[PDB]
Structures are given as structure tokens and as C-alpha cells.
């Protein structure tokens, strides 16, 4: 199919170079250079348990893309033992072909949170990579709170 092939081109030319998370203070809480967007494998991350007590977290995402995108955006879900507890939407917008970009996002928490000791290893963050309405990939990170 025609859309399938375009999605595979975009995936092929895409790379997450690095990321970090700060208290919205700022204070780096987590950082990494592993490309967590790679689909098909379950990635793992260890975050400080005190992140659960932040009102907001500031994220920085550095990525490269050989393909042009008209509307790059993410849909991200927290899954707890298979169950979706919370969802976020983030839009970056237009991406220049063969560009490298730094993206800043403010992530806010919504209800009361289970303890870190209950959550740890039982939380999966699922990220869906879209160009407008075309799904380019799905990736997963399992979280441990340390
Ligand atoms: C296709 O574009 C991308 C870009 C980035 C990703 C990276 S995954 C990711 N992004 N934000 C968060 C945190 C928030 C809960 C949403 N996480 C998960 C996470 C949580 C803790 C430590 C490291 C990663 C995947 C695909």
C-alpha cells in the first residue's frame, strides 16, 4: 500500500539522538543517548522515584529526520499492568528534510498516584509516532522507579 511505504521511508530516515527530563527545577532528573524510539524491542529506563511527586516535568528531545514531515506529533500512554491510566498529545509540526531539531515539551500530571514501589516495573510508556494522521511507528519503554 502507498501510505505504508511512506511510513517506512520516514521511519528509516528518523533518529532520536538524545533526551532529558527536568523538574518544571529545572534540575535534570533523567537523561539518555539510547534511541528509545526504536520499535519492536522493549526499552528500559530507571527514573528517580521522586519524579512521581513533580507537578510538571520539562522534556527535551533531539532528533534527526531525512524525510520532510508536515505535522510530526506524538501520542503517549501510561499503561499499568496492561491498562491505560493516562494519555498525552504533543505536536511538533513541520520538519525540514535532513534537519536536526531540539523539541521542548511541558508534561503535566493529572487524580492521585500509586506509590513508586507498586508502579515499578509495572508501567509501560507507549509512544505512537505520527505524521498528521499517518502512523509511522509504535515504541515502548518499561519504567523502574529507583
Ligand atoms: C518518535 O518520536 C519519539 C520521541 C521520543 C521517544 C522517547 S519515549 C518518551 N518520551 N517522553 C517520555 C516521558 C513521558 C511520560 C511522555 N518518554 C518515555 C520515557 C520515560 C522516562 C525515561 C525515558 C523515556 C519515542 C519516540
From Swiss-Prot:
Interacts with the prenylated catalytic subunits of PDE6, an oligomer composed of two catalytic chains (PDE6A and PDE6B) and two inhibitory chains (gamma); has no effect on enzyme activity but promotes the release of the prenylated enzyme from cell membrane. Interacts with prenylated GRK1 and GRK7. Interacts with prenylated Ras family members, including RAP2A and RAP2C. Interacts with prenylated RHEB and NRAS. Interacts with prenylated HRAS and KRAS. Interacts with RAB13 (prenylated form); dissociates RAB13 from membranes. Interacts with prenylated INPP5E. One of its GO terms (cellular component) is cytoplasm. Promotes the release of prenylated target proteins from cellular membranes. Modulates the activity of prenylated or palmitoylated Ras family members by regulating their subcellular location. Required for normal ciliary targeting of farnesylated target proteins, such as INPP5E. Required for RAB28 localization to the cone cell outer segments in the retina. Modulates the subcellular location of target proteins by acting as a GTP specific dissociation inhibitor (GDI). Increases the affinity of ARL3 for GTP by several orders of magnitude. The lineage of its organism: Eukaryota, Metazoa, Chordata, Craniata, Vertebrata. This is Retinal rod rhodopsin-sensitive cGMP 3',5'-cyclic phosphodiesterase subunit delta. Belongs to the PDE6D/unc-119 family. It is found in: Cytoplasm, Cytosol; Cytoplasmic vesicle membrane; Cytoplasm, Cytoskeleton, Cilium basal body. One of its GO terms (biological process) is visual perception. Keywords: Cell projection, cGMP, Ciliopathy, Cytoplasm, Cytoplasmic vesicle, Cytoskeleton, Joubert syndrome, Membrane, Sensory transduction, Vision. Gene3D superfamilies: GMP phosphodiesterase, delta subunit (2.70.50.40). GO terms for molecular function: GTPase inhibitor activity; small GTPase binding. It comes from Homo sapiens. Its main location: cytoplasm. SUPFAM superfamilies: E set domains. Residues 140-146 are annotated as: Required for association with membranes.
Amino acid at each position: 500500500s502507498a501510505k505504508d511505504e511512506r511510513a517506512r521511508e520516514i521511519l528509516r530516515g528518523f533518529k532520536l539522538n538524545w533526551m532529558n527530563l527536568r523538574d518544571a527545577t529545572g534540575k535534570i532528573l533523567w537523561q539518555g543517548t539510547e534511541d528509545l524510539s526504536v520499535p519492536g524491542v522493549e526499552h528500559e529506563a530507571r527514573v528517580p522515584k521522586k519524579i512521581l511527586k513533580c507537578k510538571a516535568v520539562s522534556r527535551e528531545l533531539n532528533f534527526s529526520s531525512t524525510e520532510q514531515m508536515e505535522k510530526f506529533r506524538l501520542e503517549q500512554k501510561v499503561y499499568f499492568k496492561g491498562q491505560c491510566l493516562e494519555e498525552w498529545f504533543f505536536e511538533f509540526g513541520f520538519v525540514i528534510p535532513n534537519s536536526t531539531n531540539t523539541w521542548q515539551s511541558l508534561i503535566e500530571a493529572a487524580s492521585q498516584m500509586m506509590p513508586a514501589s507498586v508502579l515499578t516495573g509495572n508501567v509501560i510508556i507507549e509512544t505512537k509516532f505520527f505524521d498528521d494522521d499517518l502512523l509511522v511507528s509504535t515504541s515502548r519503554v518499561r519504567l523502574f522507579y529507583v
